[PDB]
Short mmCIF file of N, CA and C (backbone and C1' of nucleotides) in Angstrom, two decimals:
data_model
loop_
_atom_site.label_atom_id
_atom_site.label_comp_id
_atom_site.label_asym_id
_atom_site.label_seq_id
_atom_site.Cartn_x
_atom_site.Cartn_y
_atom_site.Cartn_z
N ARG A 1 74.82 80.63 127.83
CA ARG A 1 73.50 80.87 127.30
C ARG A 1 72.78 81.98 128.04
N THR A 2 73.08 83.25 127.67
CA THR A 2 72.50 84.33 128.41
C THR A 2 71.05 84.70 127.90
N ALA A 3 70.21 85.31 128.80
CA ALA A 3 68.93 85.78 128.46
C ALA A 3 68.81 87.22 128.69
N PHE A 4 68.44 87.94 127.72
CA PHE A 4 68.41 89.43 127.80
C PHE A 4 67.17 89.97 128.51
N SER A 5 67.25 91.17 129.06
CA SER A 5 66.15 91.74 129.80
C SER A 5 65.14 92.40 128.85
N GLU A 6 64.04 92.98 129.34
CA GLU A 6 63.05 93.65 128.59
C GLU A 6 63.48 95.04 128.10
N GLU A 7 63.84 95.80 129.17
CA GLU A 7 64.35 97.18 129.05
C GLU A 7 65.55 97.20 128.05
N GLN A 8 66.44 96.26 128.22
CA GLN A 8 67.57 96.15 127.33
C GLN A 8 67.13 95.68 125.88
N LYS A 9 66.16 94.93 125.73
CA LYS A 9 65.59 94.52 124.47
C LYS A 9 65.00 95.59 123.60
N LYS A 10 64.25 96.50 124.28
CA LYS A 10 63.57 97.54 123.57
C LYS A 10 64.63 98.50 123.05
N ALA A 11 65.71 98.77 123.91
CA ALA A 11 66.80 99.62 123.47
C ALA A 11 67.55 99.09 122.31
N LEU A 12 67.92 97.88 122.33
CA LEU A 12 68.63 97.16 121.16
C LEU A 12 67.74 97.34 119.90
N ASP A 13 66.41 97.15 120.05
CA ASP A 13 65.51 97.25 118.91
C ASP A 13 65.51 98.67 118.35
N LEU A 14 65.38 99.66 119.17
CA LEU A 14 65.27 101.07 118.72
C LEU A 14 66.62 101.40 118.00
N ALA A 15 67.71 100.98 118.61
CA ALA A 15 69.04 101.33 118.08
C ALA A 15 69.14 100.68 116.80
N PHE A 16 68.45 99.53 116.56
CA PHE A 16 68.55 98.75 115.34
C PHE A 16 67.76 99.47 114.28
N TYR A 17 66.45 99.72 114.52
CA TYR A 17 65.59 100.32 113.66
C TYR A 17 66.12 101.61 113.10
N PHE A 18 66.88 102.35 113.93
CA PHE A 18 67.54 103.56 113.38
C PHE A 18 68.73 103.18 112.50
N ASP A 19 69.74 102.50 113.05
CA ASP A 19 70.82 102.12 112.20
C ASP A 19 71.11 100.58 112.45
N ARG A 20 71.06 99.77 111.43
CA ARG A 20 71.22 98.29 111.61
C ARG A 20 72.62 97.88 112.01
N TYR A 21 73.54 98.75 111.78
CA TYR A 21 75.03 98.53 112.13
C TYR A 21 75.35 99.54 113.35
N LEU A 22 75.80 99.01 114.42
CA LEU A 22 76.03 99.95 115.53
C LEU A 22 77.54 100.34 115.47
N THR A 23 77.74 101.68 115.79
CA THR A 23 79.12 102.23 115.80
C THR A 23 79.82 101.72 117.12
N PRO A 24 81.12 101.44 117.00
CA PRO A 24 81.93 100.95 118.19
C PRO A 24 81.80 101.79 119.39
N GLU A 25 81.93 103.09 119.35
CA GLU A 25 81.89 103.93 120.51
C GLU A 25 80.38 104.05 120.99
N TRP A 26 79.46 103.77 120.07
CA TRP A 26 78.08 103.71 120.42
C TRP A 26 77.71 102.39 121.13
N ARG A 27 78.29 101.37 120.55
CA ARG A 27 78.07 100.02 121.09
C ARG A 27 78.65 99.85 122.55
N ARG A 28 79.83 100.44 122.75
CA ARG A 28 80.30 100.47 124.21
C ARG A 28 79.44 101.22 125.11
N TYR A 29 78.91 102.28 124.50
CA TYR A 29 77.91 103.18 125.25
C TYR A 29 76.62 102.35 125.70
N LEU A 30 76.08 101.65 124.72
CA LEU A 30 75.00 100.79 125.06
C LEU A 30 75.26 99.72 125.98
N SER A 31 76.45 99.04 125.76
CA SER A 31 76.91 97.91 126.48
C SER A 31 77.08 98.25 127.95
N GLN A 32 77.63 99.44 128.27
CA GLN A 32 77.94 99.75 129.62
C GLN A 32 76.56 100.36 130.18
N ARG A 33 75.70 100.89 129.29
CA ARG A 33 74.41 101.49 129.80
C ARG A 33 73.44 100.41 130.31
N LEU A 34 73.24 99.43 129.41
CA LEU A 34 72.29 98.38 129.69
C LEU A 34 72.84 97.30 130.63
N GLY A 35 74.13 97.42 130.80
CA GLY A 35 75.04 96.54 131.71
C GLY A 35 75.58 95.35 131.08
N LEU A 36 75.34 95.11 129.84
CA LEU A 36 75.84 93.89 129.22
C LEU A 36 77.16 94.02 128.65
N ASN A 37 77.68 92.89 128.08
CA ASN A 37 78.94 92.94 127.41
C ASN A 37 78.79 93.28 125.92
N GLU A 38 79.72 93.98 125.39
CA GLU A 38 79.73 94.38 124.00
C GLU A 38 79.53 93.20 123.02
N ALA A 39 80.03 92.01 123.44
CA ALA A 39 79.89 90.80 122.56
C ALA A 39 78.45 90.39 122.44
N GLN A 40 77.69 90.32 123.54
CA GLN A 40 76.25 89.95 123.52
C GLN A 40 75.52 90.80 122.49
N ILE A 41 75.77 92.17 122.54
CA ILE A 41 75.15 93.09 121.65
C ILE A 41 75.34 92.74 120.22
N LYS A 42 76.64 92.48 119.85
CA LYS A 42 77.02 92.10 118.46
C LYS A 42 76.28 90.84 118.08
N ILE A 43 76.32 89.79 118.88
CA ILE A 43 75.69 88.49 118.48
C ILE A 43 74.20 88.64 118.33
N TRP A 44 73.64 89.57 119.11
CA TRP A 44 72.25 89.86 119.07
C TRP A 44 71.97 90.60 117.73
N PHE A 45 72.90 91.46 117.32
CA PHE A 45 72.71 92.11 115.96
C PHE A 45 72.74 91.10 114.85
N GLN A 46 73.68 90.16 114.93
CA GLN A 46 73.81 89.05 113.87
C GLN A 46 72.47 88.28 113.81
N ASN A 47 72.01 87.85 115.05
CA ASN A 47 70.74 87.01 115.05
C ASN A 47 69.54 87.89 114.56
N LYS A 48 69.58 89.18 114.84
CA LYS A 48 68.53 90.15 114.37
C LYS A 48 68.54 90.12 112.86
N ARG A 49 69.65 90.48 112.24
CA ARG A 49 69.73 90.59 110.83
C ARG A 49 69.43 89.35 110.06
N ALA A 50 69.53 88.24 110.78
CA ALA A 50 69.02 86.94 110.38
C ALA A 50 67.49 87.14 109.94
N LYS A 51 66.77 87.80 110.79
CA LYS A 51 65.31 88.03 110.44
C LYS A 51 65.22 88.82 109.18
N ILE A 52 66.15 89.82 108.97
CA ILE A 52 66.18 90.68 107.77
C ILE A 52 66.32 89.77 106.47
N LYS A 53 67.24 88.76 106.58
CA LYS A 53 67.42 87.80 105.46
C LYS A 53 66.16 86.93 105.19
N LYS A 54 65.19 87.03 106.07
CA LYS A 54 63.90 86.28 105.86
C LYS A 54 62.95 87.01 104.91
N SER A 55 63.40 88.11 104.33
CA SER A 55 62.52 88.86 103.36
C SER A 55 63.47 89.32 102.23
N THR B 1 80.07 78.61 100.13
CA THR B 1 80.71 77.36 99.72
C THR B 1 80.99 76.46 100.97
N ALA B 2 80.88 75.20 100.77
CA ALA B 2 81.13 74.20 101.87
C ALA B 2 82.25 73.31 101.51
N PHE B 3 83.23 73.22 102.34
CA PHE B 3 84.40 72.37 102.02
C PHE B 3 84.13 70.91 102.37
N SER B 4 84.74 70.04 101.64
CA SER B 4 84.59 68.60 101.93
C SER B 4 85.44 68.18 102.96
N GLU B 5 85.43 66.90 103.37
CA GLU B 5 86.29 66.37 104.41
C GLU B 5 87.71 66.26 103.76
N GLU B 6 87.69 65.75 102.58
CA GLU B 6 88.88 65.49 101.78
C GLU B 6 89.75 66.83 101.75
N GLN B 7 89.01 67.96 101.43
CA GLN B 7 89.57 69.22 101.29
C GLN B 7 90.13 69.78 102.57
N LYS B 8 89.35 69.56 103.63
CA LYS B 8 89.83 70.02 104.98
C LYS B 8 91.03 69.23 105.40
N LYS B 9 91.09 68.00 104.96
CA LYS B 9 92.25 67.17 105.30
C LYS B 9 93.49 67.50 104.58
N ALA B 10 93.35 67.84 103.28
CA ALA B 10 94.54 68.35 102.54
C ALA B 10 94.93 69.73 103.03
N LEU B 11 94.03 70.62 103.26
CA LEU B 11 94.37 71.90 103.73
C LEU B 11 95.06 71.82 105.08
N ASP B 12 94.58 70.93 105.90
CA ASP B 12 95.19 70.66 107.25
C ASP B 12 96.62 70.15 107.09
N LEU B 13 96.86 69.20 106.23
CA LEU B 13 98.14 68.75 106.05
C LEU B 13 99.14 69.83 105.57
N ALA B 14 98.67 70.54 104.54
CA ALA B 14 99.59 71.49 103.86
C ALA B 14 99.92 72.68 104.88
N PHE B 15 98.98 72.89 105.81
CA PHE B 15 99.19 73.99 106.79
C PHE B 15 100.24 73.40 107.72
N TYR B 16 99.95 72.21 108.39
CA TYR B 16 100.77 71.72 109.41
C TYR B 16 102.27 71.54 108.97
N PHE B 17 102.47 71.42 107.68
CA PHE B 17 103.82 71.41 107.28
C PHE B 17 104.49 72.84 107.36
N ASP B 18 103.94 73.84 106.63
CA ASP B 18 104.41 75.24 106.70
C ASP B 18 103.26 76.11 106.85
N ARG B 19 103.31 76.95 107.91
CA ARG B 19 102.10 77.74 108.20
C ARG B 19 101.82 78.97 107.26
N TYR B 20 102.76 79.33 106.42
CA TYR B 20 102.60 80.41 105.44
C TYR B 20 102.68 79.86 104.12
N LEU B 21 101.74 80.20 103.23
CA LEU B 21 101.51 79.60 101.95
C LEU B 21 102.24 80.36 100.80
N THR B 22 102.90 79.62 99.89
CA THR B 22 103.56 80.31 98.74
C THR B 22 102.75 80.19 97.45
N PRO B 23 102.82 81.16 96.56
CA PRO B 23 102.12 81.16 95.25
C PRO B 23 101.86 79.86 94.54
N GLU B 24 102.98 79.08 94.48
CA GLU B 24 102.98 77.82 93.74
C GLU B 24 102.18 76.79 94.58
N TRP B 25 102.07 76.99 95.76
CA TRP B 25 101.24 76.13 96.68
C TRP B 25 99.82 76.42 96.54
N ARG B 26 99.41 77.66 96.41
CA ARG B 26 98.01 78.05 96.24
C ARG B 26 97.54 77.69 94.90
N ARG B 27 98.38 77.90 93.81
CA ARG B 27 98.03 77.42 92.46
C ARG B 27 97.88 75.86 92.48
N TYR B 28 98.82 75.18 93.02
CA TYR B 28 98.73 73.72 93.10
C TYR B 28 97.45 73.28 93.84
N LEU B 29 97.24 73.76 95.05
CA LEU B 29 96.09 73.49 95.92
C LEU B 29 94.76 73.81 95.19
N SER B 30 94.70 75.01 94.58
CA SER B 30 93.65 75.47 93.83
C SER B 30 93.24 74.45 92.68
N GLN B 31 94.30 73.97 92.05
CA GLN B 31 94.15 73.22 90.83
C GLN B 31 93.81 71.77 91.23
N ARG B 32 94.20 71.18 92.34
CA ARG B 32 93.88 69.85 92.68
C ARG B 32 92.45 69.82 93.38
N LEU B 33 92.22 70.76 94.28
CA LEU B 33 90.99 70.79 95.03
C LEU B 33 89.87 71.47 94.26
N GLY B 34 90.21 72.14 93.16
CA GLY B 34 89.18 72.75 92.31
C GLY B 34 88.82 74.22 92.65
N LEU B 35 89.46 74.72 93.72
CA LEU B 35 89.06 75.93 94.27
C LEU B 35 89.87 77.10 93.62
N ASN B 36 89.59 78.30 94.05
CA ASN B 36 90.37 79.41 93.63
C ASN B 36 91.45 79.76 94.64
N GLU B 37 92.54 80.22 94.18
CA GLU B 37 93.64 80.53 95.05
C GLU B 37 93.26 81.49 96.20
N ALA B 38 92.26 82.25 95.90
CA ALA B 38 91.70 83.23 96.85
C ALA B 38 90.94 82.46 97.94
N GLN B 39 90.18 81.47 97.58
CA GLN B 39 89.47 80.67 98.56
C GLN B 39 90.50 80.00 99.52
N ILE B 40 91.58 79.51 98.99
CA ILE B 40 92.63 78.86 99.77
C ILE B 40 93.39 79.91 100.64
N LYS B 41 93.68 81.09 100.02
CA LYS B 41 94.39 82.17 100.74
C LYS B 41 93.60 82.46 101.94
N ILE B 42 92.32 82.56 101.82
CA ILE B 42 91.40 82.95 102.89
C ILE B 42 91.43 81.79 103.91
N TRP B 43 91.50 80.56 103.43
CA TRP B 43 91.58 79.49 104.35
C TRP B 43 92.80 79.41 105.21
N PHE B 44 93.96 79.70 104.71
CA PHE B 44 95.14 79.86 105.56
C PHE B 44 95.05 81.05 106.57
N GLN B 45 94.46 82.11 106.11
CA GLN B 45 94.19 83.25 106.96
C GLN B 45 93.33 82.90 108.17
N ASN B 46 92.24 82.22 107.89
CA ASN B 46 91.32 81.80 109.01
C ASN B 46 91.96 80.80 109.88
N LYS B 47 92.84 79.90 109.34
CA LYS B 47 93.52 78.92 110.16
C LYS B 47 94.46 79.60 111.16
N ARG B 48 95.30 80.48 110.71
CA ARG B 48 96.27 81.10 111.59
C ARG B 48 95.48 81.92 112.70
N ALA B 49 94.35 82.53 112.24
CA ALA B 49 93.41 83.14 113.17
C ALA B 49 93.06 82.22 114.25
N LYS B 50 92.67 80.95 113.93
CA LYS B 50 92.26 79.99 114.91
C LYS B 50 93.36 79.60 115.89
N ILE B 51 94.63 79.42 115.33
CA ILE B 51 95.75 79.02 116.19
C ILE B 51 96.16 80.19 117.18
N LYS B 52 96.09 81.42 116.79
CA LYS B 52 96.38 82.55 117.65
C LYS B 52 95.27 82.83 118.64
N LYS B 53 94.14 82.29 118.41
CA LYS B 53 92.98 82.43 119.34
C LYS B 53 92.93 81.35 120.42
N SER B 54 93.82 80.33 120.29
CA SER B 54 93.90 79.15 121.22
C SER B 54 95.37 78.77 121.33
P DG C 1 55.42 70.19 116.44
"O5'" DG C 1 54.87 71.17 117.61
"C5'" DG C 1 55.47 71.12 118.92
"C4'" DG C 1 56.27 72.41 119.13
"C3'" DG C 1 57.45 72.63 118.23
"O3'" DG C 1 57.01 73.21 116.97
"C1'" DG C 1 57.95 73.28 120.46
P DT C 2 58.08 73.86 115.95
"O5'" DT C 2 58.12 75.47 116.37
"C5'" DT C 2 56.96 76.00 116.95
"C4'" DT C 2 57.36 77.22 117.81
"C3'" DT C 2 58.08 78.31 117.06
"O3'" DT C 2 57.82 79.57 117.67
"C1'" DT C 2 59.40 77.60 118.80
P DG C 3 58.37 80.95 116.92
"O5'" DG C 3 59.67 81.36 117.83
"C5'" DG C 3 59.52 81.33 119.28
"C4'" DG C 3 60.74 82.05 119.80
"C3'" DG C 3 61.50 82.97 118.99
"O3'" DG C 3 62.06 84.05 119.76
"C1'" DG C 3 62.99 81.20 119.53
P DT C 4 62.92 85.22 119.20
"O5'" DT C 4 64.40 85.07 119.73
"C5'" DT C 4 64.47 84.64 121.12
"C4'" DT C 4 65.92 84.18 121.28
"C3'" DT C 4 67.01 84.97 120.70
"O3'" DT C 4 68.06 85.19 121.70
"C1'" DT C 4 67.31 82.79 120.00
P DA C 5 68.99 86.40 121.62
"O5'" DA C 5 70.28 85.97 122.47
"C5'" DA C 5 70.07 85.24 123.64
"C4'" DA C 5 71.16 84.13 123.75
"C3'" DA C 5 72.55 84.65 123.52
"O3'" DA C 5 73.41 84.12 124.47
"C1'" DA C 5 72.01 82.77 122.09
P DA C 6 74.96 84.64 124.53
"O5'" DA C 6 75.80 83.54 123.74
"C5'" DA C 6 75.72 82.17 124.26
"C4'" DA C 6 76.37 81.14 123.36
"C3'" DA C 6 77.76 81.52 122.81
"O3'" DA C 6 78.65 80.53 123.04
"C1'" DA C 6 76.33 80.98 121.06
P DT C 7 80.25 80.80 122.70
"O5'" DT C 7 80.53 79.79 121.48
"C5'" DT C 7 79.99 78.46 121.50
"C4'" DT C 7 80.13 77.83 120.07
"C3'" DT C 7 81.41 78.12 119.36
"O3'" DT C 7 82.13 76.88 119.13
"C1'" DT C 7 79.55 78.37 117.86
P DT C 8 83.63 76.84 118.69
"O5'" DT C 8 83.49 77.03 117.06
"C5'" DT C 8 83.97 76.03 116.24
"C4'" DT C 8 83.22 76.00 115.01
"C3'" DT C 8 83.99 76.22 113.70
"O3'" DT C 8 84.38 74.93 113.11
"C1'" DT C 8 81.89 77.30 113.72
P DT C 9 85.57 74.91 112.04
"O5'" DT C 9 84.89 75.71 110.76
"C5'" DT C 9 83.81 75.14 110.07
"C4'" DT C 9 83.35 76.05 108.91
"C3'" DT C 9 84.45 76.45 108.05
"O3'" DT C 9 83.98 76.51 106.66
"C1'" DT C 9 83.51 78.41 108.80
P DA C 10 85.01 76.37 105.47
"O5'" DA C 10 84.82 77.61 104.46
"C5'" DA C 10 83.49 77.86 103.95
"C4'" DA C 10 83.31 79.22 103.64
"C3'" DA C 10 84.49 79.86 102.69
"O3'" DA C 10 83.81 80.32 101.56
"C1'" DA C 10 84.06 81.26 104.50
P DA C 11 84.70 81.15 100.47
"O5'" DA C 11 84.38 82.70 100.77
"C5'" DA C 11 83.09 83.07 101.04
"C4'" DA C 11 83.09 84.59 101.51
"C3'" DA C 11 84.03 85.41 100.67
"O3'" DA C 11 83.34 86.59 100.21
"C1'" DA C 11 84.27 85.78 103.10
P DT C 12 84.11 87.62 99.29
"O5'" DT C 12 84.36 88.84 100.42
"C5'" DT C 12 83.36 89.05 101.37
"C4'" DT C 12 83.57 90.33 102.08
"C3'" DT C 12 84.40 91.47 101.41
"O3'" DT C 12 83.53 92.61 101.17
"C1'" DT C 12 85.08 91.16 103.70
P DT C 13 84.12 93.92 100.50
"O5'" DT C 13 84.75 94.73 101.74
"C5'" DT C 13 83.97 95.04 102.88
"C4'" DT C 13 84.67 95.98 103.83
"C3'" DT C 13 85.54 97.09 103.24
"O3'" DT C 13 85.18 98.33 103.96
"C1'" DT C 13 86.77 95.93 104.73
P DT C 14 86.10 99.64 103.63
"O5'" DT C 14 87.36 99.60 104.58
"C5'" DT C 14 87.09 99.56 106.02
"C4'" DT C 14 88.50 99.58 106.76
"C3'" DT C 14 89.50 100.59 106.22
"O3'" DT C 14 90.04 101.38 107.22
"C1'" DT C 14 90.50 98.48 106.57
P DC C 15 91.00 102.65 107.00
"O5'" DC C 15 92.42 102.41 107.75
"C5'" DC C 15 92.70 101.05 108.07
"C4'" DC C 15 93.80 100.96 109.15
"C3'" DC C 15 95.03 101.83 108.94
"O3'" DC C 15 95.73 101.97 110.23
"C1'" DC C 15 95.49 99.58 108.36
P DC D 1 96.90 94.62 94.23
"O5'" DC D 1 97.78 93.19 94.52
"C5'" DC D 1 99.11 93.07 93.93
"C4'" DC D 1 99.82 91.93 94.61
"C3'" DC D 1 99.10 90.89 95.46
"O3'" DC D 1 99.67 89.66 95.52
"C1'" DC D 1 100.41 92.22 96.93
P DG D 2 99.04 88.39 96.35
"O5'" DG D 2 99.68 88.55 97.79
"C5'" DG D 2 100.82 87.87 98.14
"C4'" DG D 2 101.18 87.97 99.60
"C3'" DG D 2 100.24 87.19 100.57
"O3'" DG D 2 100.93 86.67 101.69
"C1'" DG D 2 100.12 89.45 101.11
P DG D 3 100.26 85.55 102.71
"O5'" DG D 3 100.17 86.46 104.02
"C5'" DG D 3 101.28 87.15 104.51
"C4'" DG D 3 100.79 87.99 105.72
"C3'" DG D 3 99.75 87.31 106.63
"O3'" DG D 3 100.27 87.31 107.94
"C1'" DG D 3 99.11 89.58 106.06
P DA D 4 99.37 86.81 109.15
"O5'" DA D 4 98.85 88.20 109.85
"C5'" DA D 4 99.77 89.13 110.49
"C4'" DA D 4 99.07 90.15 111.32
"C3'" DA D 4 98.06 89.66 112.36
"O3'" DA D 4 98.11 90.52 113.55
"C1'" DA D 4 96.89 90.83 110.66
P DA D 5 97.33 90.00 114.85
"O5'" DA D 5 96.06 90.88 114.86
"C5'" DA D 5 96.13 92.31 114.89
"C4'" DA D 5 94.79 92.98 114.60
"C3'" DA D 5 93.65 92.40 115.47
"O3'" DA D 5 92.89 93.46 116.05
"C1'" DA D 5 93.06 92.47 113.08
P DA D 6 91.80 93.15 117.16
"O5'" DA D 6 90.45 93.63 116.47
"C5'" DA D 6 90.49 94.60 115.38
"C4'" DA D 6 89.19 94.84 114.77
"C3'" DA D 6 87.88 94.31 115.50
"O3'" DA D 6 86.71 95.27 115.15
"C1'" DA D 6 88.04 93.20 113.46
P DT D 7 85.38 95.21 116.04
"O5'" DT D 7 84.28 94.95 114.89
"C5'" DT D 7 84.53 93.97 113.94
"C4'" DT D 7 83.60 94.13 112.81
"C3'" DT D 7 82.16 93.64 112.97
"O3'" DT D 7 81.36 94.38 112.10
"C1'" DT D 7 83.30 92.24 111.49
P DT D 8 79.77 94.25 112.21
"O5'" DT D 8 79.24 93.26 111.02
"C5'" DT D 8 79.78 93.60 109.63
"C4'" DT D 8 79.42 92.49 108.72
"C3'" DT D 8 78.12 91.78 109.03
"O3'" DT D 8 77.37 91.71 107.84
"C1'" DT D 8 79.79 90.22 108.70
P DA D 9 75.75 91.21 107.96
"O5'" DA D 9 75.73 89.90 107.05
"C5'" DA D 9 76.32 89.96 105.73
"C4'" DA D 9 76.49 88.50 105.14
"C3'" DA D 9 75.21 87.68 105.33
"O3'" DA D 9 74.95 86.78 104.23
"C1'" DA D 9 77.03 86.66 106.47
P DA D 10 73.55 86.13 103.94
"O5'" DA D 10 73.87 84.57 104.08
"C5'" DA D 10 75.00 84.02 103.36
"C4'" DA D 10 75.36 82.69 103.98
"C3'" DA D 10 74.19 81.83 104.32
"O3'" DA D 10 74.29 80.55 103.79
"C1'" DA D 10 75.69 81.92 106.10
P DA D 11 72.93 79.70 103.59
"O5'" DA D 11 73.12 78.42 104.54
"C5'" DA D 11 74.34 77.68 104.42
"C4'" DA D 11 74.58 76.94 105.78
"C3'" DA D 11 73.35 76.24 106.43
"O3'" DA D 11 73.61 74.89 106.69
"C1'" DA D 11 74.65 77.57 107.95
P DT D 12 72.54 73.96 107.27
"O5'" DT D 12 73.11 73.43 108.67
"C5'" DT D 12 74.45 73.79 108.99
"C4'" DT D 12 74.82 73.40 110.38
"C3'" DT D 12 73.77 72.61 111.15
"O3'" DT D 12 74.45 71.44 111.77
"C1'" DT D 12 74.51 74.55 112.44
P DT D 13 73.57 70.66 112.99
"O5'" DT D 13 74.24 71.35 114.32
"C5'" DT D 13 75.61 71.47 114.47
"C4'" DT D 13 75.99 72.03 115.83
"C3'" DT D 13 75.40 71.27 117.01
"O3'" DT D 13 76.40 71.17 118.05
"C1'" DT D 13 74.62 73.45 117.14
P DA D 14 75.89 70.64 119.48
"O5'" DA D 14 75.35 71.94 120.23
"C5'" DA D 14 74.12 72.03 120.86
"C4'" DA D 14 74.20 72.84 122.13
"C3'" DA D 14 73.66 72.20 123.35
"O3'" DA D 14 74.60 72.45 124.46
"C1'" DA D 14 72.31 74.04 122.56
P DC D 15 74.24 73.54 125.50
"O5'" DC D 15 72.99 73.07 126.26
"C5'" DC D 15 72.50 73.76 127.38
"C4'" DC D 15 71.94 75.12 127.02
"C3'" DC D 15 70.82 75.62 127.85
"O3'" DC D 15 71.29 76.61 128.72
"C1'" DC D 15 70.39 75.98 125.51
P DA D 16 70.19 77.29 129.82
"O5'" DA D 16 69.60 78.51 129.02
"C5'" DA D 16 68.30 79.01 129.29
"C4'" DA D 16 67.54 79.30 127.98
"C3'" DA D 16 66.13 79.80 128.17
"O3'" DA D 16 66.03 81.19 127.87
"C1'" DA D 16 66.45 78.28 126.33
#
DNA sequence: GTGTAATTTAATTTC
DNA sequence: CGGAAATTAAATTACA
């Protein structure tokens, strides 16, 4: 049960609001940049888009 | 779609017998369980996926 | 008590 | 076409 940071959260949000689907070579980039694992990022995307399904 | 327990149990039996499904088996399974052969095909796919993951 | 990460299961796109 | 590998959506389960 991981908890994400603030600096990391703003980045995932920006990357989302630009494109809701992240590119594999972009997602590795983000993943090694923010220090997280590429899996966390994906699951975060899924849980994000959940909010999209709320409208 | 949500599968029943009965359906999961049938799918489970048919898989544990032979891991790869034949056309007459997906027609039969589709016709008894009420599903589409595609639903079933997908089910075998996801099953073998689970076995190779563990 | 809400909010969200992580887990299943059914369905998809691509090689 | 059917199958394998990688993602996605939908619904639920546990930590937060």
